[PDB]
Every structure is written in structure tokens, then in C-alpha cells.
UniProtKB/Swiss-Prot annotation:
Residues 1-221 form the Peptidase S1 domain. It comes from Bos taurus. Is inhibited by scorpion cyclotide trypsin inhibitor TopI1. It is found in: Secreted, Extracellular space. Its cofactor is Ca(2+). It catalyses: Preferential cleavage: Arg-|-Xaa, Lys-|-Xaa. The gene is PRSS1. Its EC number is 3.4.21.4. Ca(2+) binds at residues 52, 54, 57, 62. Binds 1 Ca(2+) ion per subunit. Subsequent cleavage after Lys-125 leads to alpha-trypsin. Further cleavage after Lys-170 yields pseudotrypsin. A cleavage may also occur after Arg-99. Not sulfated on tyrosine residue(s). InterPro entries: Peptidase_S1_PA, Peptidase_S1_PA_chymotrypsin, Peptidase_S1A, Serine_Proteases_S1, Trypsin_dom, TRYPSIN_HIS, TRYPSIN_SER. This is Serine protease 1.
């Protein structure tokens, strides 16, 4: 996250880190046994780390659980990033508590103007590299579809939305992928892609979660 702030330990209780020897992607806890992430985060050998703040220090609130299966969206396109969403089933159910908690799926899509919270352990520099050990947060509004499409001509589908600031300076970045955009207590977005980080007129682009609730529900019902 660029231009954000330090969340505070365990204040974002649905945030997970995906680890394959190191943190490589974020995700969100949707129930005691299921995580949602970006399909571009797919790989084998994923351990899901919950209850994290400092990802390099065991602080006492963590649950580390192996994934038993992952399901990439049937229509994921790796070239265009259309349908950038995947589900991961944990080997065992997490123990939910004040520091580890699920986030609710949306009943409705969120509208342009809504303020949201984006979080992750990704790079914190727009040019140059510095990866935080602790969780960073950013408040950002959802941008209009028009602003989005004009920022990225020909690249925005109905399954994507832009959030951030046209002026730049604050944005998601590398390492934040898969992570949550929460608005009014509902998971509305998944960190997906961007043209660099925090550049003017190039806001981060997010998977529109409200388009997938039926797929998610259906898939968790039979897996
Ligand atoms: B995620 O992997 O950590 C990361 C998040 C992110 C990256 C950038 C940049 N630059 C800005 C905001 C968020 N996501 C990416 O690296 C995604 C996944 C693969 C490539 N990518 C992009 O952001 C690309 N820079 C742009 C892209 C757009 C359409 C098709 C392919 C790549
Ligand atoms: Ca670690």
C-alpha cells in the first residue's frame, strides 16, 4: 500500500496472508474454512496465515492452516485479468475470535463514492521498493465507471472497478494482490492490478465481488 497508514495489530481481522515460504498474496476470510483471493495468486503449496500483523514475527494471534484445495474461477483470463477471483479451502476450520473473523459477502454492489478500506503487506513506494512487515491500510472511495474506463481505455470489464485517487499518491501496490476492499462491512473488491502504483490518473483496479456471490455460495455448498 502506498500512502496509507499502519492498521494496528489485528484491527483488520479477516485479512489473511498467503504463504509459500514467504508472503506472496493477500486474501479474505469468508467463513471458518474458506478464503477468497485473486486467481492470479494461484499456486500449489499454499499455507494460509490468519491473525497476522507482523508477518516476520510470531506475535501470538496467528493460525497457520494449509489449504486443502483451491478453485480458480472457471472463466478467469490471465491475459486480461477478467474474473480475477479464486477460492481456497483450508484443511481445518479456523477458530474465530475478535482478532480472527470472517467478512460478509455483499448483498448489493457498492456505488461510486463509497469509502472503503484497502489493506495489505505490499510495497509502500511508488518508485522504489520497501515492503512493510506490518499491515498497512488505506481509505479510498470507489471511482465512477467513466473515470475508470477513461483511465484505462479498453481494459475495464463489468467485473472490475477502480478505487483510489486520480491525483495519485495513494494506492495499492505489488504484494497487495488478492487482498480485501471492504465497504460498509461488506467485501466489495479484491486487489487485482494497476499501472504502476500511485501514479496520477492510474488508480488501482479491483475485482467486483458482488458479481460472484452466487458462484461463491454455490461452490462452497458442494466443496
Ligand atoms: B498483486 O500481484 O500483488 C499486484 C497488485 C498491484 C500491482 C500494481 C502494479 N504495477 C498496482 C496495483 C496493484 N498485481 C499485479 O502485479 C497484477 C497481476 C499481474 C500484473 N499486474 C498488474 O498490476 C499489471 N501491472 C498490469 C496488468 C493489466 C492487465 C493484464 C495484465 C497485467
Ligand atoms: Ca512469515
Amino acid at each position: 500500500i502506498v500512502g496509507g497508514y499502519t492498521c494496528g495489530a489485528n484491527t483488520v481481522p479477516y485479512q489473511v496472508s498467503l504463504n509459500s515460504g514467504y508472503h506472496f498474496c493477500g486474501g479474505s476470510l469468508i467463513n471458518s474454512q474458506w478464503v477468497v483471493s485473486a486467481a492470479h495468486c494461484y499456486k500449489s503449496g499454499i499455507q494460509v496465515r490468519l491473525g497476522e500483523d507482523n508477518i516476520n514475527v510470531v506475535e501470538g494471534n496467528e493460525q497457520f492452516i494449509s489449504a486443502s484445495k483451491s478453485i480458480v474461477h472457471p472463466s478467469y483470463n490471465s491475459n486480461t485479468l477478467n474474473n480475477d477471483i479464486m477460492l481456497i479451502k483450508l484443511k481445518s476450520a479456523a477458530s474465530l475470535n475478535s482478532r480472527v473473523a470472517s467478512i460478509s459477502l455483499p448483498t448489493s454492489c457498492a456505488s461510486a463514492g463509497t469509502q472503503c478500506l484497502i489493506s495489505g503487506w505490499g510495497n509502500t513506494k511508488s518508485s522504489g521498493t520497501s515492503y512493510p512487515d506490518v499491515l498497512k491500510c488505506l481509505k479510498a472511495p470507489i471511482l465512477s465507471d467513466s473515470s475508470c474506463k477513461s483511465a484505462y481505455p479498453g481494459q475495464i470489464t463489468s467485473n472490475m472497478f477502480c478505487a483510489g485517487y486520480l491525483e495519485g499518491g495513494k494506492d495499492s501496490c505489488q504484494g497487495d494482490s488478492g487482498g480485501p476492499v471492504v465497504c460498509s462491512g461488506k467485501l466489495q473488491g479484491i486487489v487485482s492490478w494497476g499501472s504502476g502504483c500511485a501514479q496520477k490518473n492510474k488508480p488501482g483496479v479491483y475485482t467486483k465481488v458482488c458479481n460472484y456471490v452466487s458462484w461463491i455460495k454455490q461452490t462452497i455448498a458442494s466443496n
